Design an enzyme around this catalytic site. Sequence first.
Site, mmCIF file in Angstrom:
data_model
loop_
_atom_site.group_PDB
_atom_site.id
_atom_site.type_symbol
_atom_site.label_atom_id
_atom_site.label_comp_id
_atom_site.label_asym_id
_atom_site.label_seq_id
_atom_site.Cartn_x
_atom_site.Cartn_y
_atom_site.Cartn_z
ATOM 1 N N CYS A 126 155.403 59.674 61.968
ATOM 2 C CA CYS A 126 155.878 61.047 62.299
ATOM 3 C C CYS A 126 156.798 61.239 63.497
ATOM 4 O O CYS A 126 157.371 62.236 63.606
ATOM 5 C CB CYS A 126 154.774 61.917 62.364
ATOM 6 S SG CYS A 126 154.174 62.771 60.937
ATOM 7 N N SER A 174 137.538 67.690 61.144
ATOM 8 C CA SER A 174 138.865 67.643 60.452
ATOM 9 C C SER A 174 138.814 68.181 58.867
ATOM 10 O O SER A 174 139.491 68.811 58.560
ATOM 11 C CB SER A 174 139.360 66.218 60.140
ATOM 12 O OG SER A 174 139.536 65.629 61.384
ATOM 13 N N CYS A 191 155.883 65.319 63.592
ATOM 14 C CA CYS A 191 154.974 65.792 62.775
ATOM 15 C C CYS A 191 153.439 65.490 63.089
ATOM 16 O O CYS A 191 152.704 65.440 62.082
ATOM 17 C CB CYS A 191 155.190 65.698 61.307
ATOM 18 S SG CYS A 191 155.609 63.972 60.703
ATOM 19 N N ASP A 192 153.327 64.972 64.319
ATOM 20 C CA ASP A 192 151.892 64.759 64.877
ATOM 21 C C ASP A 192 151.624 66.140 65.442
ATOM 22 O O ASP A 192 152.029 67.196 65.019
ATOM 23 C CB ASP A 192 151.969 63.565 65.850
ATOM 24 C CG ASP A 192 152.820 63.652 67.042
ATOM 25 O OD1 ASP A 192 153.913 64.617 66.813
ATOM 26 O OD2 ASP A 192 152.709 62.844 68.174
ATOM 27 N N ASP A 217 146.685 60.889 65.699
ATOM 28 C CA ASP A 217 145.442 60.771 65.443
ATOM 29 C C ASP A 217 145.058 59.924 64.219
ATOM 30 O O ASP A 217 143.849 59.642 64.035
ATOM 31 C CB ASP A 217 144.974 62.346 65.095
ATOM 32 C CG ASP A 217 144.870 63.135 66.246
ATOM 33 O OD1 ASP A 217 145.192 62.634 67.470
ATOM 34 O OD2 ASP A 217 144.520 64.468 66.037
ATOM 35 N N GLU A 255 138.611 65.403 67.547
ATOM 36 C CA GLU A 255 138.553 65.602 66.332
ATOM 37 C C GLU A 255 137.523 64.625 65.477
ATOM 38 O O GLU A 255 137.754 63.396 65.697
ATOM 39 C CB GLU A 255 139.789 66.062 65.813
ATOM 40 C CG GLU A 255 139.803 66.847 64.685
ATOM 41 C CD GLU A 255 141.038 67.342 64.116
ATOM 42 O OE1 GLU A 255 142.073 66.916 65.144
ATOM 43 O OE2 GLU A 255 141.673 67.804 63.134
#
EC number: 4.2.1.9
Length: 520
Positions: free
Chosen positions: A59, A438, A132-133, A91, A412
């Site tokens: 990402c 999550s 896109c993290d 993540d 998370e």
Amino acid sequence: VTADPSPPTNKLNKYSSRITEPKSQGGSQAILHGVGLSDDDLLKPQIGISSVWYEGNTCNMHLLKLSEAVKEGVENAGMVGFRFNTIGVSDAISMGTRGMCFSLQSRDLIADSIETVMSAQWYDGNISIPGCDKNMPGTIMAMGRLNRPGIMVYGGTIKPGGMYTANTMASAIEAMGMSLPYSSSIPAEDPLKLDECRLAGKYLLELLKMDLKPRDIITPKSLRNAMVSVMALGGSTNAVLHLIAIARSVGLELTLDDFQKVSDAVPFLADLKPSGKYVMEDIHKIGGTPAVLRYLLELGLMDGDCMTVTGQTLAQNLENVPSLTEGQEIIRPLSNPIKETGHIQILRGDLAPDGSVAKITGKEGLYFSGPALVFEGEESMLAAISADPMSFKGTVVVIRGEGPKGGPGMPEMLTPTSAIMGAGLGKECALLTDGRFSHGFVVGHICPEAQEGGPIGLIKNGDIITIDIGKKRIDTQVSPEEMNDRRKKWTAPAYKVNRGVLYKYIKNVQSASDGCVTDE
């Protein structure tokens, strides 16, 4: 809000003139000549171009190429571009490990990083390029603190991808007016993403001419617009944390109850993963985020009067974008929603007196009751379900000590839900945490966290816990008097670290109900 330097008017270089004009700053002007600026360049606005490139994530590994295109566009618009870059973490790499304790706080580190550079270098405006993290709200927080004209260029979602944190926040930030139309839905590496990069300078120039600043764009109504997009698209519960943090960065208030009221007012319409069928590229193919917002605006769910980084209002941007393509099945009509109200639910009650956050589909029933099965972290819960899975049937599983201070870092957790599902127990138990997760009842963000002496830290195995969605309460059959007796005997556990960035986070972070902000 008092955070960053004030400018020394209709000048486009309101900040950089602090170092380019007065003769007492010749050392500044000398360094600027050294980095390539001519005498005429000293008259131009200076734009900080902050990317989150790094090679450990698909990402983010291509964002230097986007940053180069943004700089070219800034130069074409008659301005000077200064690229810099901050950290981010993946993540997907760290999920299931103690590395996940470092993830949420990196949002606030990114905000600090960009604020620091913009302030020290006297840049007039910012273009940020997150990937896109999950850290992109940190770029908006920095813009809110500085209150200098800025635009967020989403790196784009990788095509094969659903409404996880990155897609949720990118769409919400577009709905909020802080990204250009289609920024959230154009795929990563699409030719149109590079074209957007090269146009951001033109738009930012106009924002400097208007002096249209983040606190002019990010308002209670545009925050509501962002929340509407989260509800309508089935966005992540993480958006609660990030939108509260963004609201605070511009000096506004946003509470859990504000989310509940938008959830109650806005139906879930998007047939998108994880809940549904499709991904962001499928939305791209049927008209993108602007088509979705155009429909929501026509339904009267959004305020079209809000100013955006195009220099025009949301309604003006959407007035002429192509509508959702005829026959598409991703976005439901108002008459046949996937859910009458939003997925996001705020719960209080005895065990979450300061709030908690659940994603509720409407297909899990309205109640769950069971004896508590309490674990002081993810590891012991996973060990117990491995060795004795049937001891979990009918229980309310409590994973505590995973909050902002207790985790530390509010990690998370994905393995607890897949382990429950793998054992066949999905609808046969409930899951509660002061951290984040999550087909059953799953609640996170429980406040106060166990480390702060909240009631979740006082639960004992066998306590009967009752989750009531209609009443929006997580209760215990333990009497309030016996809960207060336990509180009187409770002592805070020792912190899990005593140095480094996570110890600073422990020292600074507010509760999950307060968006885990660190600078108040």
